């Protein structure tokens, strides 16, 4: 029946964002993928009386050759904020992360059922561009729950709950989280049965539709910080040692870089093992294979993700809210920098989404213009996190090497 | 006429209402005029008389038109405009002649009284009310039924109004290309003389059925064309005639215009430098100032005037064929490039100087250009071109891999245009056996601008120069530099401040900064340099000592 009187944040207008210049194949795809959609009544053109705009891209499923259309409601979401968050937002089960394995299900084509609050349809305006701007460019609007939009789940919520009732009822141990367009379900059931239970779940959906993605958070554990083991030891090697310990010292309340640091000298000159500095590495090594004591997750502040590139298709990433207060730190491994990072990001995000229920702020070690040109090609997720390009400090890259 | 097209529901902003602005008396004939004009527009329906009920009004003045001796009705809507709404941007981007597919026959049509031919929204006409004064404050007032000239939504609505009015006919003729730039229709087809002119009388009728008039049968226009600074033939394209009248004295202005004209010609004219002409534009100059033409300039202008001599021409696009794009090193921070499909018949040229960044090495500079060109090719031809570059697949690999940041060029080949791009020096992966260890350091009094940059050594040595007006961020790039001169060819250096490390750590091969520069040649001279860092002010052998 009638829709949820969607209401924006007083003291702000809709979004108005330029359309990315898109390749021929993405434009083709979108125009077709969009002709039907209106046909299907899910959208309809719009007059010039609509100032608003949102970017949109085309992506491919799981490497598959079928184009999925991706709208970037990144902005709009901020404008709706309080509504989808402090209004009807869905809570987050700390249970998820704990399950032995979690499948991620794309259940967003469901929204295209529920109707969008008419008076709110204008905000969802987007635009299919044109090669060399030789023709104006088709302009559309949503008259239903859009996908990449954070407003959709909050609304569809109530429905979703009901759809899941019976199932959940029959296995009060499966934990179903919901974050934009996708459903996260976890269970400690050996794989076979999990896969079963998920496929079984699939079935419920089908009807309300008016195995898969195997992910196992349980086996996650913070990437330690390693200090070489050597056997020779020279100024340089020991000089770097402390340098690192200097950084460590920073965080990890307890780090001790004295006996070592206290040991002029010639660079290439090798030396021994300090009678009783051994306990330095020994003791220090310890607290490093450890989780930063004193660091906790603040829900009121948002998450921040940092990635540095270490040659050899290797990448190290830390997650924190307060510089040098790491909550998470891991790594990740047609070979191009851009693709790999794009993957790392998605990887990081997911984990983040599974741990805290929100996406981090990314600091991408790359030229904006370049990322801002290629990311789509290897992008598959149905969400888009916040990012900001930077220049990697020198030693850093090393300290996490 | 007034198009029978549907209307666009216009609207005001939320907490706002119509415009009401005192209409201040006009002069004798100005009135006479405005009355004459208005009578006609009404005689057609452009306007219609409103009672005294309409609370709303916007000022209206006339103005003598230079041509012949006629007045023109002119109505500032500043108010009705400030109070109106926002519209889908009319401005978004112009095509580029190079992006255009090649057509056989082509003709432009200009639209009669466009604006006054599109019917404004009924429920909005009330807000356009304006008043023709009496020789001295009885009154007489009108309203708009069509799009007012200086309004605000007028542009948008028109553009929209026309796309549709054009929609069908297009469906009817999928092969045709129509482009809409203001009071102008550009029509292109590969069909020849015979069925093109006929193909037009067609469009003409179509446009008429929808209320728009056009130039006469034998009363139109043919290429070359002028448009946004271009000259457009149905097979080729160029920038419009660019003249440089001879002159001995150039005002700051003169040359700005010069530089401007020149930067434009570079879309199609290969080999146009304006670098020694931008120098000349250095400092708080005052437009009217006369500037001497430092040798470089003069030389330029000529080689510029030369290249210009011969008229040149870009070609159009062939969707089937690939896009070849090949860059060239043109000298210290300057890069030129051409894009083409066949022998060497460019579709467009272009250049690149965007040398932002403090310290930079060719490689990067070169890559940056690829990016630049990449995006550019994407919007014009909806696809990325294959690249041919003045760099060895290897010299690149070596770089991109050791480098911290992320990169990715599309597909490219090596060319041998002999200003090849290379790494002018390499740091040392590990320390160096039998090399003076240099614990360097730069200091300074934070409140006097005086410090001291010295260095020790595992070999007993010791030194310290007297630094005048330098910040840590400069004395440090001096603790090093020093250690570069007093050491042999193979050294070990050790500084604090990631800063110094940062910059050097990044094999930069030229900087806007003499000092760094120096410390560059120094390296290009050496034969083995290892750069190491340590926790600034701590109890560390070496660094401690130097700390005095
Ligand atoms: O006719 C025009 C224009 C005229 C001026 C500026 C832009 C265009 C345009 O996109 N179109 C439609 C496409 O035209 C194409 S594909 N090819 C042309 C068109 C017109 C000429 Br003179 C030469 C080549």
Curated annotation (Swiss-Prot), chain A:
Listed result of changing residue 180 to I: 54% loss of polymerase activity according to PubMed:9533880; increases polymerase activity according to PubMed:9657675. No loss of RNase H activity
Effect on the protein upon substituting residue 180 to L: 90% loss of polymerase activity. No loss of RNase H activity
Effect on the protein of changing residue 70 to V: No loss of polymerase activity. No loss of RNase H activity
Annotated consequence of substituting residue 152 to G: Complete loss of polymerase activity. No loss of RNase H activity
Effect of residue 61 to E: Strong decrease in RT binding affinity for all dNTP substrates and in catalytic efficiency. 100-fold decreased sensitivity to ddNTP inhibitors
Effect annotated for changing residue 281 to S: 59% loss of polymerase activity. 8% loss of RNase H activity
Motif (Tryptophan repeat motif): 371-387
Phenotype for residue 168 to R: In strain: Isolate PV22
RT 'primer grip': annotated segments: 211-216
UniProt-reported outcome of changing residue 277 to L: 68% loss of polymerase activity. 10% loss of RNase H activity
Name of the protein: p51 RT
UniProt source species: Human immunodeficiency virus type 1 group M subtype B (isolate BH10)
Source organism phylogeny: Viruses, Riboviria, Pararnavirae, Artverviricota, Revtraviricetes
Gene this protein is translated from: gag-pol
Portion of the full sequence shown: 604 to 1027 of 1447
